[PDB]
Design a protein around this ligand. Structure first.
Ligand SMILES: Nc1ncnc2c1ncn2[C@@H]1O[C@H](COP(=O)(O)OP(=O)(O)O)[C@@H](O)[C@H]1O
Ligand SMILES: [Mg+2]
Lengths: 49, 48, 48, 147, 247, 232, 244, 241, 196, 245
């Protein structure tokens, strides 16, 4: 104690957390219009960013 | 709460007398993006 | 060790509340958190 | 809020009853409560983004309510009741609360009305902690200035 | 290597499964017994790790027979079977041979005998618990005994077992007298147990019972004066409160 | 992996049992026999081994009943047991039901026997493959028994050591011998042709052949010596 | 750690607790469902989630809630195999008690004989412990509403309300706050229906997810009877919540 | 090694299990039988103690098996419990069958056989109990045996089993005599016990005693477990207290 | 002890005489012989008392499990469970049991089990030592699918004849109506039926 | 995963699984494709039986069996392990006929089977069964089709699949359910049953197959089980060939 005193746990992005992660990424690369993000998140259940 | 509060004012922690608290262990499965969060915390403070 | 950690959480919460001193509410909340002894038998409650 | 088709489907519902708005507006003079309930059917649903469907209707309605010297009491009870019961997404029901501040702050319909009314708004959103915790600032400044 | 049969002895002697069973016992709740000259008081504390769980549902003080109750320290599941097997042997061996409940001394041997079998076989584990059994009979007086998962029994004036044993034991050593009332013995009991926990000590969560003198109240039938009521009596919370207030 | 091969009650990750696969390997390690059949007859032809040339052979053909019989390939201990049990089933059928036990049902009971020891601790997969023939009401049938217990109806099959040369041969003539009917002799002939190609570094002798025939109007009979010297 | 004796429930650890018996408490989150039961003032309601991940399954055979005997329910968490075996045993026990002792078997006597049976499975090495938490519900002939949770170790303890599953802790805290503020140990609602409504409200809150009439299965104990509700009776209760 | 079953042998023809089971008996308290030609005295030391242990109303290593033969106990008490009960049944079974009490030699033989059986047969522990037998039967008079946990027996005129076996035996044979006396025998157990034990108090609370005599009455045989207050009384006389 | 079970359009009504006889002494005046084994299946007992009693409880245990495990039991189903016990204990027990029950899909069904054991679907059954005097009355006056009131009258008359002509029949006239509406008890006193 | 915990079928792993029981499922994967199509008036079973040597007699080896006389079963996995499971299912059904004198309810059947798998995961000298068994029929309560997994777990199904080609098999099965809300008429569900197995035989392209389809129908078999044979089976073959090209 006095070096590390607090522990902050990081878990996974949630069912509506996973949603946000798509949005940053699609913008970053090139795309022709995509909108299927409501389905894609269910397929991608339990994924890391 | 851990970092930002005592940095602006060490002044409140000093009134109470309890030490301003430091040391955070970040953990979780890889790809969590906790190194990305390292940036976001210090982005608010504009900290180096 | 358990006593040093109760006063530790007592001063931390105080700062969150934006009060300058501890202060019976800060002592009481922090008391009940980290009493220690029996805190992993919640799901192994065949133990008693 | 999952899928884009169910939000649209509530906007259809909202739109048909906006034609009938002059009929709703007539029943508000008879008694204010009667006029609220027909709109409450579409906003109170399990699904979210329903006061963003129904945004077009309550934008006009809260001006009549505000402007009167009695109807703004039933207006405040309505704003608190949406918060607690549903409170839909972070922007939905939260919009109606926010629109009350704009119209209220500029109008000053009476001084007695304005002074109490602001207290009522701030009350609920101390409790809240999302998007109207940012809007909390807006109405706390306005109130503190009067005092 | 000698640890993990029941069949393997160490070079130094003893069997490991018995040794490891004793470890198990000491993890359980703090329970204690004091022999008096007109009673025996037997006491334990209880928990459930969730307040939602009711505390009468559990019973950690159980009358074995009307004149002999018991407690434990150790694993919960093992107690409940072993008490069923004990009541059931109590009838077989002795409530058809005397036509009523057996003396205390007898029944200690019979329960100790089920332990001896749960060591004797291999591929059958010992029981996880150590009992205190206290009861009263008409020839040896009031009495107290410890029955270990070893299949050995030891007579005791006072003893404690479980987590708070080592501390409870030294407090008992000092404070015990050779002649105490039933009433004084209860006060030494509540107090001893209050060493183990404070601030969550109340009569609700403390189960404390006695084997005292006959009660005509729980006999349930009247007009036959040539049989004695239950020597065992369970005390309630509110009654424990009278004694805890009176301290 | 190869460490789950210790016992039969334990599975491997990909899911096998190494013991059943091993019992299977044993069939190959033993004797060779070639089975084939026709709509009117069933014939087994098998190579008998001898330890040395002061040995006078060990028969591989077990008459089950006067309408059923089998050959063996692999462990001789294993075989003695399964045959004895099968003989019990035919007598049972006769006794209680008055019926020549059908070849189709029979293999399935054989399969049931097999699986008892595969499930259980103790026992062992039976170390032998058997080719069972019979002629019932539904004509000839020829069954292929496995250590797993799977029973497989064929026109012609062969098992045992280096038996694939009979299988390549039978495949070539398949439909040819199916047409051969009403002529027991010719099916014996074809069968000798099939087990010749399988052999290599040995050729046939009078006492290496045991030819086992049951057909339409003939019982099960095991032929030996001077009844296999028309087909030497 | 390891060495022997996570391979045996008849051989102790140097801890004094059997490691494989502890694994049955880690085998209870396997199907990822959560249960809630609460007590009324003459009924017991128990609700556990239904997962039908594919349209191939029929939501009428997907259940975890069982009729054990006329007056007795059970909801199971953890795998289907030990669920059936436990349920069977219970069905057989309930049935037996009656011919021996006469009347309907109390929730408590059933729970206790199943707990004693779980402890035996751990006693012997030739039988493993079960892999389920059993939460039994009945309204008793003389003790009225009763919930007894029997864990796969052979521990059994009663409840005012209980929850089980992997998201349990969240329902458990939700319930602590509720029963503490009212200052009672019961729900004071006097029909079975408004007690089913309250239970729906509370599982929605705790987990934080709206559920559908194809994702709930609800069994209701009243005095003298037990029933499992179909999807269309379950909707009545839902539409009651959805506009009050 | 060749620990792993009890139905194995070793490269040297020892069996580790028989040796290990034997060392178990030197973990439990001293037990002494001294035969004299005017009685046999059994004396034993306890292996447990404390001011709240009751041991002043009870015996737990002197059991009368039947009415003319008794044993002192050394070894595990759990192991001991079952075999004492079996031994008492067979001694007394003889009683029923033949309507005269069992001879000493037969009863020790029987119980040794039962012992041996647990090593010989099955997948069970040997029994780690060494019983000192003291009997009277009119065939050989006074008889002293002890049985090994290996499961065999040899007669004795003095023996000591239980803790500190080697030390006790040396002590006993320095001061023993063949003529002897029963009263000199009591004093001898008390003599040996002072030295052997690791408790320097050596008071009544640690001590068990029974003397079996045929000089007690005449034509009659008396087994007397002494009571705790007699055990105290004799400690003054030998001067240890 | 005449017991009977008669079909009608909406169900089946089981009828009984509650006399219980150990020789010329009446052992108990009033004992219904109609003993429920399930909610909507009930049974009638005649012959040796003790034997039928023993058997009955054994049937309730089978049907407690049938409900529990495999969903609703049937009358057909139930009567088979009688037939099994009686037939295997044909040398130790003598039980004359009429099993009848009301289905919602087959309507009322009556299966009699005679003393050796068989199953016999029939519109009507009479069994016991009191039924052997009313055989003549029952066939002639019966017609299928009466209405309940008319049904009651026929049953009532037959069991009342049976007391007049059999001395081991007597006590109150019990009936248990097994209908969709529930289960209804009916009871009748001698003042009423001796006349009718 | 880790070492140990596999070996013995009653050792629980630190993961809350029993590895031995999983390892069985993997053995079932290798077996030949089977499906069941439930209907609103029947059940259909179809199966992929590979012919692996052409000296085999055609239409003569089957993994279709009847149980009692009203319930169809078909298994995947290891064949003789699958024969024993249907075999205990015949003893149970048969016992049932003496005691209760009625055909088995299909859910009643499922309960009994589910217990047997659970017992051979319950000891240390028995072996966990390495088979699935799709089975069902039509009884008093209309049509029901169940699938029993080698874990000792079962459920009702509107469509069940097991085997190698089981992923392809589920894709077509779902489609059937959506275009047909009634749950598809039984007759046409035979022709459909052929086509789905033809598409699954393209993940097993190397070996020939023989198509065996059997059914149980209230309407067109009088509530009895019987195999589909002759011209009827021919139509199902011809339809399937058509729609795959
Ligand atoms: N919360 C998030 N929002 C957007 N991108 C994210 C988020 N979380 C994870 N990512 C993505 O994952 C990548 C890897 O995370 P990084 O910070 O390198 O992780 P770790 O140390 O946990 O491996 C990120 O650079 C980013 O692209
Ligand atoms: Mg990093």
């Amino acid at each position: 104690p006095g070096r590390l005193d607090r522990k902050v746990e990081i878990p996974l992005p949630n069912e509506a957390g996973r949603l946000e992660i798509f949005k940053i990424h699609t913008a970053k690369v090139k795309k022709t219009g995509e909108f299927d993000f409501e389905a894609a998140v269910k397929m991608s259940d339990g994924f890391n960013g | 709460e851990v970092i930002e509060l005592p940095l602006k004012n060490p002044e409140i922690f000093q009134r109470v007398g309890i030490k301003p608290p430091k040391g955070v262990l970040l953990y979780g499965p890889p790809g969590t993006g906790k190194t990305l969060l390292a940036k976001a915390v210090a982005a608010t403070i504009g900290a180096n | 060790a358990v006593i040093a950690a109760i006063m530790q959480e007592a001063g931390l919460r105080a700062v969150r509340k934006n009060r300058y001193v501890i202060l019976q509410s800060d002592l009481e909340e922090a008391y009940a958190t980290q009493v220690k002894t029996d805190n992993t038998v919640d799901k192994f409650d065949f133990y008693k | 809020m999952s899928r884009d088709a169910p939000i649209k489907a509530d906007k259809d519902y909202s739109q048909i009853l906006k034609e009938e708005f002059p009929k709703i507006d007539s029943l508000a003079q008879n008694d204010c409560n009667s006029a609220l309930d027909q709109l409450l059917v579409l906003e109170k649903k399990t699904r979210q983004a329903s006061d963003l469907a129904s945004s077009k209707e309550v934008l006009a309605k809260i001006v009549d309510l505000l402007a009167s010297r009695n109807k703004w009491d039933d207006l405040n009870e309505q704003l608190t009741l949406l918060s607690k019961k549903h409170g839909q997404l972070k922007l939905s029901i939260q919009y109606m609360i926010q629109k009350v501040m704009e119209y209220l702050k500029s109008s000053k319909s009476l001084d007695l009305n304005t002074r109490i009314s602001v207290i009522e708004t701030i009350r609920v959103v101390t409790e809240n902690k999302i998007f109207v915790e940012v809007e909390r600032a807006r109405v706390t400044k306005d109130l503190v200035e009067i005092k | 290597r000698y640890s993990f049969s029941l069949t393997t002895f160490s070079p130094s002697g003893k069997l490991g499964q018995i040794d490891y069973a004793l470890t198990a016992v000491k993890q359980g709740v703090t329970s204690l017994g004091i022999k008096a000259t007109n009673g025996v008081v037997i006491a334990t504390e209880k928990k459930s790790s969730s307040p939602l769980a009711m505390s009468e549902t559990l019973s950690k003080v159980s009358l074995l027979t009307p004149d002999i109750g018991a407690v434990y320290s150790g694993m919960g599941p093992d107690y409940r079977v072993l008490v069923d097997k004990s009541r059931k042997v109590a009838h077989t061996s002795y409530k058809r041979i005397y036509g009523e409940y057996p003396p205390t001394k007898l029944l200690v041997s019979e329960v100790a005998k089920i332990m001896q079998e749960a060591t004797q076989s291999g591929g059958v584990r010992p029981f996880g618990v150590s009992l205190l059994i206290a009861g009263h009979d008409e020839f040896n007086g009031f009495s107290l005994y410890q029955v270990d998962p070893s299949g050995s029994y030891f007579p005791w004036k006072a003893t404690a077992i479980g987590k708070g044993s080592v501390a409870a034991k030294t407090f008992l050593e000092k404070r015990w007298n050779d002649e105490l009332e039933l009433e004084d013995a209860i006060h030494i009991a509540l107090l001893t147990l209050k060493e183990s926990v404070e601030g969550e000590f109340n009569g609700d969560t403390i189960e404390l019972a006695i084997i005292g003198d006959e009660n005509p109240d729980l006999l349930g039938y009247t007009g036959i004066p040539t049989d004695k009521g239950p020597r065992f009596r369970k005390l309630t919370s509110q009654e424990i409160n009278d004694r805890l207030e009176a301290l | 992996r190869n460490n789950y091969d210790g016992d039969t009650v334990t599975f491997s990750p990909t899911g096998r049992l190494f013991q059943v696969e091993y019992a299977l390997e044993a069939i190959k390690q033993g004797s060779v026999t070639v089975g084939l059949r026709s709509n009117t007859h069933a014939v087994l032809v098998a190579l008998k081994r001898n330890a040395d040339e002061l040995s006078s052979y060990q028969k591989k053909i077990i008459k089950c009943d006067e309408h059923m019989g089998l050959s063996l390939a692999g462990l001789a201990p294993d075989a003695r047991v399964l045959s004895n049990y099968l003989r019990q089933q035919c007598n049972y059928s006769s006794l209680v039901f008055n019926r020549k036990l059908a070849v189709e049902r029979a293999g399935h009971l054989l399969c049931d026997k097999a699986q008892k020891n595969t499930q259980s601790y103790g026992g062992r997969p039976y170390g032998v493959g058997l080719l069972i023939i019979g002629y019932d009401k539904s004509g000839a049938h020829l069954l292929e028994f496995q250590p797993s217990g799977n029973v497989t109806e064929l026109y012609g099959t062969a098992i045992g050591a280096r038996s694939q040369g009979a299988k390549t041969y039978l495949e070539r003539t398949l439909d040819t011998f199916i047409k051969i009917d009403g002529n027991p002799d010719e099916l014996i002939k074809a069968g000798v042709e099939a087990i010749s190609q399988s052999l290599r570094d040995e050729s046939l002798t009078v006492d290496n052949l045991s030819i086992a025939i049951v057909g339409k109007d003939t019982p099960f009979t095991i032929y030996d010596g001077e009844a296999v010297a028309k087909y030497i | 750690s390891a060495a022997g004796y996570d391979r045996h429930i008849t051989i102790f650890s140097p801890e004094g607790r059997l490691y494989q018996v502890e694994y049955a408490f880690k085998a209870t989150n396997q199907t990822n469902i959560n249960s809630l039961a609460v007590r009324g003032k003459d009924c017991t309601v128990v609700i556990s989630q239904k997962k039908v991940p594919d349209k191939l399954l029929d939501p009428t055979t997907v259940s975890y809630i069982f009729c054990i005997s006329r007056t007795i329910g059970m909801v199971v968490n953890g795998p289907i195999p030990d669920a059936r075996n436990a349920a069977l045993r219970a069905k057989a026990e309930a049935a037996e008690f009656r011919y021996k002792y006469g009347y309907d078997m109390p929730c408590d006597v059933l729970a206790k004989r199943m707990a004693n049976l779980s402890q035996i499975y751990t006693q012997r090495a030739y039988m493993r412990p079960l892999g389920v938490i059993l939460t039994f519900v009945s309204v008793d002939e003389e003790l009225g509403p009763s919930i007894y949770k029997t864990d796969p170790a052979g521990y059994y303890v009663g409840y005012k309300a209980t929850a089980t599953g992997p998201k349990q802790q969240e329902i458990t805290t939700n319930l602590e706050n509720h029963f503490k503020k009212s200052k009672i140990d019961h729900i004071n609602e006097e029909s079975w229906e408004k007690v089913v409504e309250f239970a729906i409200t509370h599982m929605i809150d705790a987990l934080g997810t709206e559920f559908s009439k194809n994702d709930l299965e609800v069994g209701v104990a009243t005095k003298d009877k037990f029933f499992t509700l179909s999807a269309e009776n379950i909707e009545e209760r839902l539409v009651a919540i959805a506009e009050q | 090694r060749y620990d792993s079953r009890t139905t194995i042998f070793s490269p040297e023809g020892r069996l580790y299990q028989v040796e290990y089971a034997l060392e178990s008996i030197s973990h439990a308290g001293t037990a002494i039988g001294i035969m004299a030609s005017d009685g046999i005295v059994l004396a034993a030391e306890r292996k447990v103690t404390s001011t709240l242990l009751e041991q002043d109303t009870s015996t737990e290593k002197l059991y009368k098996l039947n009415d003319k033969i008794a044993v002192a106990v050394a070894g595990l008490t759990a192991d001991a419990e079952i075999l004492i009960n079996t031994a008492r049944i067979h001694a007394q079974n003889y009683l029923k069958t033949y309507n005269e009490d069992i001879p000493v030699e037969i009863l020790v033989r029987r119980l040794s056989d039962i012992k041996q059986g647990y090593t010989q047969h099955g997948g069970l522990r040997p029994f780690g109990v060494s019983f000192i037998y003291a009997g009277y039967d009119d065939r050989y008079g006074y008889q002293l045996y002890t049985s090994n946990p290996s499961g065999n027996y040899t007669g004795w005129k003095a023996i000591s089993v239980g803790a500190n076996t080697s030390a006790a035996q040396t002590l006993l044979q320095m001061d023993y005599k063949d003529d002897m006396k029963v009263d000199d025998a009591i004093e001898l157990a008390l003599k040996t016990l002072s030295k052997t034990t690791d408790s320097s108090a050596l008071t009544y609370d640690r001590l068990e005693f029974a003397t079996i005599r045929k000089g007690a009455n005449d034509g009659e045989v008396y087994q007397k477990i002494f009571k705790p207050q007699e055990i105290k009384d004799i400690l003054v006389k030998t001067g240890i207290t | 002890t005449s017991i009977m079970a008669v079909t009608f359009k909406d169900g089946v009504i089981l009828g009984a005489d509650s006399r219980t006889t150990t020789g010329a002494y009446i052992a108990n005046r009033v004992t219904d012989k109609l003993t429920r084994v399930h909610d909507k299946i009930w049974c009638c007992r005649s012959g040796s008392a003790a034997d039928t009693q023993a058997i009955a409880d054994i049937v309730q245990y089978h049907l407690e499990l049938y409900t529990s495990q495999y969903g609703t039991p049937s009358t057909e189903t139930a009567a088979s469970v009688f037939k099994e016990l009686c037939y295997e204990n044909k040398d130790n027990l003598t039980a004359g049991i009429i099993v009848a029950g009301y289905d919602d899909k087959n309507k009322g069904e009556v299966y009699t089990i005679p003393l050796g054991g068989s199953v016999h679907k029939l519109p009507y059954a009479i069994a016991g030592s009191g039924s052997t005097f009313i055989y003549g009355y029952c066939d002639k006056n019966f017609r299928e699918n009466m209405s309940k009131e008319e049904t009651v009258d026929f049953i009532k008359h037959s069991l009342s004849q049976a007391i007049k002509w059999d001395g081991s029949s007597g006590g109150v006239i019990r009936m248990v109506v097994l209908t969709a509406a529930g289960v209804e008890r009916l009871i009748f006193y001698p003042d009423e039926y001796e006349q009718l | 995963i880790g070492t140990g915990y596999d070996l013995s079928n009653s050792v629980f792993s630190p993961d809350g699984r029993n590895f031995q029981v999983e390892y069985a499922v993997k053995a079932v994967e290798n077996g030949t494709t089977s499906i069941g199509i439930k209907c609103n008036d029947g059940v259909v079973f179809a199966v992929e039986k590979l012919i692996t040597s052409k000296l085999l007699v055609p239409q003569k080896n089957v993994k279709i069996q009847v149980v009692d006389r009203h319930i169809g079963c078909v298994y995947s996995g290891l064949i003789p392990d699958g024969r024993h499971l249907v075999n205990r299912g015949r003893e149970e059904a048969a016992s049932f006929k003496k005691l209760y004198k009625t055909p088995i309810p299909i859910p009643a059947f499922a309960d009994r089977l589910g217990q047997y798998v659970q017992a051979h995961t319950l000891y240390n000298s028995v072996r966990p069964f390495g088979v699935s068994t799709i089975f069902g029929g039509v009884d008093k309560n209309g049509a029901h089709l169940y699938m029993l997994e080698p874990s000792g777990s079962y459920w009702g199904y509107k469509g069940a699949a097991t085997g190698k080609g089981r992923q392809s098999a589920k894709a077509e099965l779902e489609k059937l359910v959506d275009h047909h809300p009634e749950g598809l008429s039984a007759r046409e569900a035979v022709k459909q049953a052929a086509k789905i197995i033809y598409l699954a035989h393209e993940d097993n392209k190397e070996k020939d197959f023989e198509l065996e389809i059997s059914w149980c129908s209230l309407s067109e078999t009088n509530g009895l089980h019987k195999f589909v044979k002759g011209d009827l089976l021919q139509e199902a073959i011809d339809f399937a060939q058509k729609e795959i090209n």
